[PDB]
């Protein structure tokens, strides 16, 4: 698709069973959700943004699903305001910018 | 330009007559600069990023070159990580996410 600025660019993630909305996001490394149960091995990590850092849980090879598109890679989970597609996930769909 | 996001969409824009670096940041809505001067009068806002808010300066009808395209609009100054164009200036210079 081509997505147009003009809003926030909101999707619809697939990951860990659950469907959540979140921002495509050019500007994050790492891919950031909410509060969120994931399986397997992680480990604690801060991430910083405007405003300071947060605590963060990092998975590893999580597979996820977005616009159709599957892809694994990092997510990182904890209080952030709201969920970012970040780079390391971007890159798998494919996903560039244009002007 | 069509860029690709395996690294940081950092491009060089410019300011006041000045070079910067900054990051094409989809996941912004809005333009904030590290501390810099600016003409003319500013009014106050908060911005809400991953770790809190901050107070910025706003300015508005700032011209600034992106990637040199031309753009004209509203620029925050404040204590940023980073220099990040938002999409209220992304919007000027044409820029969509495509997949
Ligand atoms: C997270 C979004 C909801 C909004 N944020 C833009 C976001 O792309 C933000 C931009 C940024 C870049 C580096 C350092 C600080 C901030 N990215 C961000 O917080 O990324 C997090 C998660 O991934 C990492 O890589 C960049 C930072 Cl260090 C970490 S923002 O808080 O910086 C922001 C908010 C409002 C405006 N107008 C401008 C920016
Ligand atoms: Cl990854
Ligand atoms: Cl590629
Ligand atoms: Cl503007």
């Known amino acids: ?3 147009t600025l003009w809003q926030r660019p909101l999707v619809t993630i ?5 469907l959540k909305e979140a921002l495509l996001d050019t500007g994050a ?3 950031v959700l909410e509060e969120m149960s ?10 910083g943004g405007i405003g300071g850092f ?3 849980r990092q998975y590893d ?11 694994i890679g ?14 390391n996930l971007l890159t798998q769909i ?5 002007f």
Chains 1, 2 share one sequence.
């Open 54 to 56: 947060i605590k963060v």
């Open 14 to 18: 697939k990951i860990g069973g659950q």
């Open 38 to 47: 994931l399986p397997g091995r992680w480990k604690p990590k801060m991430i």
């Open 61 to 71: 090879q999580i597979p996820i699903e977005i616009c159709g598109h599957k892809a």
């Open 94 to 98: 494919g996903c560039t910018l244009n």
């Open 1 to 3: 698709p081509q997505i």
């Open 74 to 87: 990092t997510v990182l989970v904890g209080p952030t305001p709201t969920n970012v597609i970040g780079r």
């Open 29 to 31: 490394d790492d891919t």
